[PDB]
């Protein structure tokens, strides 16, 4: 019902030739003319006509016409009338197997793009026609149709069930082309089926036996693409249907071991993944019993840098082998050392740097699983690695930074002058390496060391800050991020020691300079603001000269992220949803300012809409947003409650709804906020207690709840009982056991103090304490340095229980430190 005319054809052919001209500007001119014509449907009818039917014209003009149309599909398919679209569809399927490889590639890319963009529900007979075309006599047609089906399976596998269950016909049919004579078709066949293994697609699982028998029959295929796809198949079958591989495990392991050494590096990388996946299964040790002795040297050998990467310098046989060795070391732990140590001896001291490098990487990879077993060798290895940090080849320096980092805990545990002092000295020198890959390795290692050492670095603080600040001049972009993180960690590790004028004036200027440089859309803000958050908590009162623009920018980031989210929610096809990391980062930095500046932030908050913005952040679908806003709420509750008090009526029900322990961090920050709000509410928190308490009690008696959530729940229940004993005390019998067991283990501080005066007051029902009194006695003995008020309180309840003497039988079940501290402080 549409046919071309010579005038229109000549203009298109003219325009298509012109688009192939070599000249500088005629190409920019032809694109503006295509831009205009692209939105006219009759033009796309001409494009597909040139591709499939103008066999007079050459191949490059025909296929370029098809590719321009492909771009129009990707952009304007919505606007295509159902008569142009059907004409393109029919011509594609009818020329799926053209004799020209370039034309055939172009038709398929059309098919594939219409199928995805425009959605398969709207091309109902595509899959049946493609499947019928698979049975064709002509090879190119069968190959081209299978080419399309494979792209479609890779792109749209998630349409298994409602076209209407097409996989129930295709998958059984793909399995029949595993035996096909042409290796190309065979690859397509198992490539298609591989898309549906992890899904446990019903059509495939009910044919799992035919699948497995056809895979075995294909194992010795000489064509790499088959071997590779057979290897992929076996690795996924390992994850979902281990049951049916079990009777063949010995031959499969034997096969994968051979393929892990394949001459084709892509085959070997697919094979190598088998070991990663097998290590997770509980059957691992039993299965590998006869092959582990060869697997370990095979893995270690593939960890060397390939020759290409050697010259160049992302996932490859090196990383995969290393990852496998890491997991295996975790599975076998010390049993692995007799396999690894001879290799390590032959590699760590080798004359050829590529070999030695791989030795050092082995040493780091096994560190976590084999740590205990290698303690005896560390007094020799660690001084050796510190010497390698000065090795002449950069890649040896950078891997040595890493594996030293993997032994940081052992190093901090030894006398600081022996290993820690020299390691840190030469890591700092390495920070200023001239090679960018070493900078990033040494910086990351140093961060790792900072986290392990904590206050052990305070004597070195000035020299660390000299090195870290200097790096601002040498680093740009990619390692500045690592550098910010090293500064953030330093601030978390030495805390308030950072708060000295010499340090502040050395560190802030370059931090603010990179701050003024970045704009509100740059994701580089994430490490910078997370760094400033840590710096502000450490610098506390000394951050005051810098906080004003820092605060107002964070509130701005939250405000714009909320507004963009609401816009996107309003018209999603016109406005893109915002990255809510900007908001999470910005909330956390405000938490850092409120913790660090304390009361000094109130003048900033008094002039802000942060609480109105916090109200909406607390209700966000995403947990990390809720988690950061509740953390900010507790911090503002401490710093400037004057401004929070009017909002409590609205915040409390929302805090009540986020006492859900499936989200640990949200649940935790919510409970902590409730506690801090209590202390400043006073008796006025009476009406809000029914909204939280019954769940808090359920949370504190829930098994396999992380210790930190339990202590915060204990501290909040204590604080709520200090403030309104009337409605809290009835539950004493129901939570005192886990309360005492958890709070027994926290340092004597203001939260501990606040919580224990709460338990004392709950004086209001002493009968809730009796049947489990052993736990309270222990909990009060946990106190080393209690302030006098709390001591006086403590003597009263213990002496009161005594007077109900007869108790000595019970009191002798005390361990000796328990019984003796109670007599020492309180005289019972």
């Amino acid at each position: 019902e549409w046919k071309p005319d010579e005038q229109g054809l000549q203009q298109i052919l003219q325009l298509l030739k012109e688009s192939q001209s070599p000249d500088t500007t005629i190409q920019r001119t032809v694109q503006q003319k295509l831009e205009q014509l692209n939105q006219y449907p009759d033009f796309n009818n001409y494009l597909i006509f040139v591709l499939t039917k103008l066999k007079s014209e050459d191949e490059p003009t025909r296929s370029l016409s098809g590719l321009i149309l492909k771009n129009n599909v990707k952009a304007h398919f919505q606007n295509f009338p159902n008569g142009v679209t059907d004409f393109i569809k029919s011509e594609c399927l009818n020329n799926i197997g053209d004799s020209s490889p370039l034309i055939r590639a172009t038709v398929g890319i059309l098919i594939t793009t219409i199928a995805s963009k425009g959605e398969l529900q709207n091309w109902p007979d595509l899959l049946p026609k493609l499947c019928s075309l698979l049975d064709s006599e002509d090879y190119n047609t069968c190959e081209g149709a299978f080419g399309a089906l494979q792209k479609i399976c890779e792109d749209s596998a998630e349409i298994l069930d409602s076209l209407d269950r097409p996989l129930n016909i295709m998958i059984p049919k793909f399995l029949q082309f595993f035996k096909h004579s042409s290796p190309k078709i065979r690859s397509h066949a198992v490539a298609c089926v591989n898309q549906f293994i992890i899904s446990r697609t019903q059509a495939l699982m009910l044919h799992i036996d035919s699948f497995i028998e056809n895979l075995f029959a294909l194992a010795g295929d000489e064509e790499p693409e088959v071997r590779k796809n057979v290897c992929r198949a076996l690795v996924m079958l390992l994850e979902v249907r281990m049951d049916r591989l079990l009777p063949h495990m010995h031959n499969i392991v034997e096969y994968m071991l051979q393929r892990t050494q394949d001459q084709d590096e892509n085959v070997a990388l697919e094979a190598c993944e088998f070991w990663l996946t097998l290590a997770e299964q509980p059957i691992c040790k039993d299965v590998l019993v006869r092959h582990l002795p060869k697997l370990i040297p095979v893995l270690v050998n593939g960890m060397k840098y390939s020759d290409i990467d050697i010259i160049l310098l992302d996932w490859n046989l090196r990383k995969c082998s290393a990852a496998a060795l890491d997991v295996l070391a975790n599975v076998y732990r010390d049993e692995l050392l007799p396999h690894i140590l001879p290799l390590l001896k032959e590699l760590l001291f080798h004359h050829e740097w590529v070999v030695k490098e791989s030795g050092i990487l082995v040493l780091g990879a096994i560190a976590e699983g084999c740590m205990q077993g290698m303690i005896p060798y560390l007094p020799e290895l660690i001084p050796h690695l510190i010497q390698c940090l000065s090795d002449k080849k950069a890649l040896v320096r950078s891997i040595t930074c890493w594996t030293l980092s993997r032994y940081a805990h052992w190093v901090v545990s030894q006398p600081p002058d022996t290993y820690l002092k020299p390691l840190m000295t030469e890591l700092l020198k390495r920070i200023l390496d001239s090679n960018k890959r070493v900078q990033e390795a040494a910086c990351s290692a140093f961060a790792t060391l900072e986290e392990e050492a904590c206050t052990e670095l305070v004597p070195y603080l000035a020299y660390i800050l000299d090195t870290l600040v200097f790096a601002f001049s040498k680093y740009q972009h990619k390692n500045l991020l690592i550098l910010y993180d090293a500064i953030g960690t330093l601030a978390d590790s030495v805390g308030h020691h950072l708060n000295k004028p010499e340090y502040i004036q050395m560190l802030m200027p370059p931090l603010i300079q990179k701050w003024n440089m970045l704009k509100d859309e740059d994701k580089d803000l994430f490490p910078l603001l997370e760094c400033l958050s840590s710096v502000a908590t450490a610098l506390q009162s000394g951050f005051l000269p810098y906080c004003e623009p820092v605060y107002q920018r964070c509130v701005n980031l939250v405000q714009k992220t909320l507004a963009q989210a609401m816009l996107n929610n309003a018209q999603p096809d016109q406005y893109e949803a915002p990255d809510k990391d900007f908001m999470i980062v910005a909330l956390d930095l405000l938490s850092g300012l409120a913790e660090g500046l304390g009361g000094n932030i109130e003048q900033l908050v008094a002039r802000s809409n942060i609480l109105t913005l916090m109200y909406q952040c607390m209700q966000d679908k995403m947990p990390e947003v809720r988690q950061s806003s509740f953390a900010l709420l507790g911090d503002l509750t401490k710093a400037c409650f004057q401004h929070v008090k009017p909002c409590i009526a609205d915040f409390m029900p929302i805090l009540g709804t986020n006492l859900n322990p499936e989200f640990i961090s949200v649940c935790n920050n919510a409970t902590w906020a409730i506690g801090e709000i209590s202390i400043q509410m006073g008796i006025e928190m009476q009406p809000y207690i029914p909204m939280v308490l019954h769940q808090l009690v359920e949370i504190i008696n829930r098994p396999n709840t992380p210790k930190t959530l339990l202590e915060n729940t204990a501290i909040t229940i204590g604080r709520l009982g200090y403030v309104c004993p009337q409605e809290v005390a009835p539950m004493l019998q129901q939570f005192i056991r886990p309360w005492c067991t958890s709070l027994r283990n926290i340092r004597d501080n203001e939260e501990k103090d606040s919580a224990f005066r709460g338990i004392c007051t709950m004086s209001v029902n002493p009968s809730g304490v009796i049947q489990d009194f052993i736990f309270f006695c222990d909990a009060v003995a946990s106190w080393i340095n209690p302030k006098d008020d709390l001591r006086d309180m403590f003597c009263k309840i213990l002496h009161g229980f005594k007077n109900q003497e007869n108790w000595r039988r019970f009191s002798d079940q005390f361990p000796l430190p328990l019984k003796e501290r109670l007599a020492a402080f309180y005289g019972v």
Partner: peptide, 19 residues
């Protein structure tokens, strides 16, 4: 303690690693 930062996890994930 009291309250969960989640900042350390973010720094660990940006850290350099050979695999």
């Amino acid at each position: 303690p009291g309250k969960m930062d989640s900042r350390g996890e973010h720094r660990q994930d940006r850290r350099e690693r050979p695999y």
